């Protein structure tokens, strides 16, 4: 028996057969703006690590005070060692 | 080609030993399970 057709896997075959697929995630980055450098190092596995400790974030949301966000009032100054 | 030949030879070896297994068990002299009969016979020609 053909297991590909039995379990309805033929549609997947017609969509993901031998074709041109980038070895990286550069099929969605170009749609986004700005120069994005692929962060595929070990330090970028946080999101995997974030799931073993859900309790770090309580049920709904952390305490928030919009008034206390006045620190976002920013002057007009330059910025070295930073390129746009 | 090699899988069939090796498998067929292995099956053949089973038949070869099967014949040897059956022929040898049938070729066991003095079909007995008691030493008393043997001892009496083993005593006869010791006397001789």
């Amino acid at each position: 028996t053909n297991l590909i057709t039995h379990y309805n896997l033929e549609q997947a075959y017609n969509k993901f057969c031998g074709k041109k697929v980038k070895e990286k995630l550069s099929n969605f980055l170009p749609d986004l703006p700005g120069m994005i450098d692929l962060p595929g190092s070990h330090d970028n596995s946080s999101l995997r690590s974030l799931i073993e400790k859900p309790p770090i974030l309580s049920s709904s949301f952390n305490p928030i005070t919009g008034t206390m966000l006045a620190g976002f009032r920013l002057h007009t100054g330059p910025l070295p060692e930073q390129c746009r | 080609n090699p899988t069939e030949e090796y498998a067929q030879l292995f099956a053949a070896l089973i038949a070869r030993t099967a014949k040897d297994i059956d022929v040898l068990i049938d070729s066991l002299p003095s079909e007995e399970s008691t030493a008393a009969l043997q001892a009496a016979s083993l005593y006869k020609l010791e006397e001789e």
Binding site: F16, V21, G40 | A7, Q8
Partner: protein
Amino acid sequence: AEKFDHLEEHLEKFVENIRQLGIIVSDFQPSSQAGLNQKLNFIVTGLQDIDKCRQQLHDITVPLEVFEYIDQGRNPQLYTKECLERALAKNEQVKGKIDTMKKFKSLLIQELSKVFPEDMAKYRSIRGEDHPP
């Protein structure tokens, strides 16, 4: 698929929001009036919309290794091809082994039939019980 799309626009909406905030703060001049804080409001409100959007697509389950490919910037689509080659090749393993050991069953049973005459009918039963009836 309607819910799939609905979540997608909000995700790309946030990405555009970050760029606008980043450009506004980067290109900051006195000629900007009330155009900065409004962008941040669209961000914070944008984040809240995603929480409501992830729950209608709750049924979707992402495999562990797939997110690993995403985390490292790997090729998850290639993994789908890898799985395709994985299933196709290993389907031959289960069948290939089965066929390898089925022919040994068929031929050996035929050999047992040619050595013992008095136990002929029994060997035919071995093949019958060797099938999955």
